[PDB]
RNA sequence: UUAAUUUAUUAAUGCAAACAGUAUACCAAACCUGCAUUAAAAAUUUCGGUUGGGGCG
RNA sequence: GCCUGUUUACCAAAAACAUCACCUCUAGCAUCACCAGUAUUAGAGGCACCGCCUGCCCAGUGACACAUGUUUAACGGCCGCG
RNA sequence: CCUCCGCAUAAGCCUGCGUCAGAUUAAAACACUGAACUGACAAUUAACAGCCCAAUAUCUACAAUCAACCAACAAGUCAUUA
RNA sequence: GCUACCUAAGAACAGCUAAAAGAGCACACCCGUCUAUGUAGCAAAAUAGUGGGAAGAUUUAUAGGUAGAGGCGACAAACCUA
RNA sequence: GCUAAACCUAGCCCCAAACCCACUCCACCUUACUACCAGACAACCUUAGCCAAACCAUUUACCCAAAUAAAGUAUAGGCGAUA
């Protein structure tokens, strides 16, 4: 996502009013691109045993491409939401016993 | 001479004049909402006052948005809240050279999505911001039911939202029979939602679609005067009869 | 092989129907009720046939259900 | 410049424009293959005239005729003078049913008959 | 700018079809190619360039008998009416192909070579090395697109494990799959090189307007460029 | 035009994003998006003064 | 100036532009032009039928090769003093 | 006395020298009364020419030039069946 | 709707010598070399004589297409409603 | 004394107030003013420039939320014309 800041400083129009723009407030300056960023990884809770990226039950951070293309559409994982976190740790609490 | 009302109020006057008045009131509120979108193509200011350099005096600061342009392909598929940035550029980032016009188009992708409520696989011309937002919202269905009308920036999104809200409001035979417990589970999952049935139909319409829908509601080919007059006549003879 | 039907002179395929016809359990609000084209959407029309047969607008049945159809070919 | 203001009649264009225009006469048939015109006798209007033989009513009126107030006929008046005695009478005998109004002259739908009123089948 | 193309005929027919000239004008109406238009009128003879297509309900190799060798206006090499079985079709004609002759349309890719005539068409796997060929495809069952003009011919160079390498008349080599059919011999109407036009009237008869008169100065490209022959073009797909 | 500014546009490249296997290594198919370079084609603008007329000096 | 022909409608019809002939460069290819064509082809150009010929040069520019190269029917150039 | 004109079709215009009345006036480059007009009245009558074809498949290689020899290139202006 | 080019389907070219012919004389037609009149003229480009072509790269009737940062151009920086 | 000269009144302008109109019958998107038949194509896009800076190359008020004031202040600007 292309992020741009405005060169030329729009002059602060009111509280209950809209800012009045001129054709010099159409001049932009690229402050960042959101590609060319070090891509973070997302967290998933697995429902099935898979290859070396994990086993069933434990959450794992994998690359966004792998987790969005293979693990989530094929039903191998669930989003690491706080809701299903509770049922998964409860199933861990009932699988491993006293 | 002068108009009585200003030119920018004729739209609301047209809403109060005719068949547009007979639309339901909650649709009229949702049409006259006029709320601001979340920032997409700019970084908003943190505070309301920002002490600046070269004089240590606090100044008010507002954040004004970017006038971003959405083509019709943004209406065909779920983009982010992002579109094209039609703007201008000084050549080598100094203002003493030429001023050139620049268009920043987003990067588009074609990925398949699944919906748990509609039980269908869609092909969408998604971007990367929508993928990140769906990941942040823990599902396509939560992303469409969650994000407001101003932030989808798509009519396909509002159609999907009205479909999901109608499915939630009706409690319909959703998935299929031979599995009603899965129906109860999926309907229980998205329960922090589900406006009434008569309010779910008017979600995400344009003004023209709502005008046509309300026009089709009161279509009503008229009643012949024979039935009206025989009703009046038999009422008069019953009135003269019982006395 | 080299097909002889140039794409520009062939019958164009219709535009893809608007996306409201993929959303299940939802009926679209289209211009069939006003009997004239507008923009903003498009309906799907049922097949039509003439109730009363007309000799100036008659359409033949297809060829393998003509009553004189034979499988083996004759040569006139 | 050509003559803009005078109206566009059938006498004006080239040899193909003449003939395609016409003057407002309602056609009575169709053109077949060999440029023949086939008249259809059910399309040409048949004048329905009566016999005026023993008729006693002139194109003018005598001035000795008295005057009266004008009253344009209204649908309530036509209902009252046409159907209201019959419905009143057979309601007094308690045999009136709101279910079948067709026996008093009401028609549920115009699709059956020859002189249907709202799409106006008949000419004049 | 109503420009509907004249090539609108969905059924193959032997009959000459009326064709409209274009004058270098594309669909918008502006000129795209200069110096074309306004010749003698022509009609189009639909050539069948897939030399091996069997008739309907027939499968194997089939024979054909030549009927006439005409003059086609729409190309350089003249064409031949060829009849066989229960249909007729126009094909491109080769040198020394006259009427009444019988030509073969083969599919069988043999173990050894086949000593073939100057008319018939075999797949490239069955032809002997060094044979002069023409009307070659680039894919099996595409149609003849390369060598077709008058008196031009390509030589088959070598046969490798699953391909055969062809030398076009531009001398650039091109390998193609082993089952691609190609006809044998040079295309008809040699001495098309030796045609003298004679006058500017013939160039107006052929449908070519004269060159424009603005003097252009030659730049850097105008010298004689001695280049190495371009690398071989491969239509064989590899995984 | 070999005058100043620029590449808004196309064509090439390189990097990034996007996809996939791959035994501590390599390969990066095609199309869009951003950035950087080169070229083609262009866009805006200018073309000082004194001068026993102007030009040359 | 090879010829027939073309042009500054309204002051210039020509020795000017085109023209058959010759030569240089670009392109291995399917459907809307080129083309329903395929290197005896198509396009960008110079010169101007024919007859005798078209001498030398890649220093520079441009183009092509990236093997310091190839290219002048490419832009162009083909000496000085005693 | 002239005729290098005229009669028609197509294209274009639309009543624009047919009758009566006014001619006191008005345009006739002057006048009579009529091509540089006013009002009223009345005509152009189709067989000539326009305005056309029920479908689905299928068929249509041998120019024209008295079309008969001869001879060609720029390769052509006309067809059906179930 | 003039004009530059193109597309669709058409039309015209007496007579003589025809060497066979983008051939010769020469009508109709197209163009406009020279002279004279005219210059608020018949005409915002004509008239009279004299000329080139006149079976072709010809002329022309109808419809359509290419439009201005452009169209088109046998390059006249020619034409695009005087 | 001929040509001539003279006229008041149609109407119009600027405001206030108030939100304003549209089928008698027939015809009118094809060659509009046409009674009557089978491909259904369809809209959403930063204004630019003259001009001022005595040239000109960044720049130059025009943007539709009532007034007055803060105030032509803080600010921006080949820190300059000006905004
Ligand atoms: Mg304030
Ligand atoms: Mg040439
Ligand atoms: Mg030249
Ligand atoms: Mg001076
Ligand atoms: Mg001086
Ligand atoms: Mg000459
Ligand atoms: Mg002149
Ligand atoms: Mg001329
Ligand atoms: Mg002259
Ligand atoms: Mg010359
Ligand atoms: Mg030389
Ligand atoms: Mg001649
Ligand atoms: Mg002559
Ligand atoms: Mg010309
Ligand atoms: Mg010149
Ligand atoms: Mg200035
Ligand atoms: Mg000044």
UniProtKB/Swiss-Prot annotation, chain A:
Judging by the UniProt lineage, the source's domain of life is Eukaryota
Q: Where in the cell is it found?
A: Mitochondrion
Its subunit composition reads:
Component of the mitochondrial large ribosomal subunit (mt-LSU). Mature mammalian 55S mitochondrial ribosomes consist of a small (28S) and a large (39S) subunit. The 28S small subunit contains a 12S ribosomal RNA (12S mt-rRNA) and 30 different proteins. The 39S large subunit contains a 16S rRNA (16S mt-rRNA), a copy of mitochondrial valine transfer RNA (mt-tRNA(Val)), which plays an integral structural role, and 52 different proteins.
- Family membership, please give it: Belongs to the bacterial ribosomal protein bL9 family.
Name of the featured protein: Large ribosomal subunit protein bL9m
Q: Which organism is it from?
A: Homo sapiens (Human)
Q: Which taxonomic lineage does the organism of this UniProt entry have? A: Eukaryota, Metazoa, Chordata, Craniata, Vertebrata
Q: Which residues of the full protein are shown?
A: 53 to 150 of 267
Curated annotation (Swiss-Prot), chain C:
Subcellular localization, per the record?
A: Mitochondrion
User: At the top level of its lineage, which domain of life is listed?
Assistant: Eukaryota
- Its family? Belongs to the mitochondrion-specific ribosomal protein mL37 family.
Question: How is the subunit organization of this protein annotated in UniProt?
Answer: Component of the mitochondrial large ribosomal subunit (mt-LSU). Mature mammalian 55S mitochondrial ribosomes consist of a small (28S) and a large (39S) subunit. The 28S small subunit contains a 12S ribosomal RNA (12S mt-rRNA) and 30 different proteins. The 39S large subunit contains a 16S rRNA (16S mt-rRNA), a copy of mitochondrial valine transfer RNA (mt-tRNA(Val)), which plays an integral structural role, and 52 different proteins. mL37 forms a heterodimer with mL65.
Q: What is this protein called?
A: Large ribosomal subunit protein mL37
Q: Which part of the entire sequence is included in the shown chain?
A: 30 to 106 of 423
UniProtKB/Swiss-Prot annotation, chain D:
Superkingdom assignment? Eukaryota
Please classify the protein's predominant subcellular localization into one broad category: mitochondrion
Keyword annotations from UniProtKB, A to Z: Apoptosis, Cell cycle, Mitochondrion, Ribonucleoprotein, Ribosomal protein, Transit peptide
The tissues in which it is expressed are:
Present in kidney, liver, thymus and testis, and at lower level in brain and spleen (at protein level).
Q: Which InterPro entries match?
A: Ribosomal_mL41
**Is the Ribosomal protein keyword given for this protein?**
yes
An annotated Gene Ontology molecular function = structural constituent of ribosome
Q: What is this protein called?
A: Large ribosomal subunit protein mL41
Q: Which organism is it from?
A: Homo sapiens
Q: Which gene encodes it?
A: MRPL41
Curated annotation (Swiss-Prot), chain E:
Compositionally biased tracts (Basic residues)? 214-223
Record's keyword terms, sorted:
Mitochondrion, Ribonucleoprotein, Ribosomal protein, Transit peptide
Any idea what this protein is called? Answer: Large ribosomal subunit protein uL2m
Primary localisation category = mitochondrion
Where's it found, cell-wise?
Mitochondrion
Family designation? Belongs to the universal ribosomal protein uL2 family.
An example Gene Ontology molecular-function term: structural constituent of ribosome
User: Which GO biological process annotations does it have?
Assistant: mitochondrial translation
The gene that this protein is the product of is MRPL2
The annotated region (Disordered) lies at 204-223
Is Ligase a UniProt keyword of this protein?
no
From which source organism is this entry? Homo sapiens (Human)
Q: What GO cellular component term, any one, is given?
A: mitochondrion
Description of how the protein assembles with itself and partners:
Component of the mitochondrial large ribosomal subunit (mt-LSU). Mature mammalian 55S mitochondrial ribosomes consist of a small (28S) and a large (39S) subunit. The 28S small subunit contains a 12S ribosomal RNA (12S mt-rRNA) and 30 different proteins. The 39S large subunit contains a 16S rRNA (16S mt-rRNA), a copy of mitochondrial valine transfer RNA (mt-tRNA(Val)), which plays an integral structural role, and 52 different proteins.
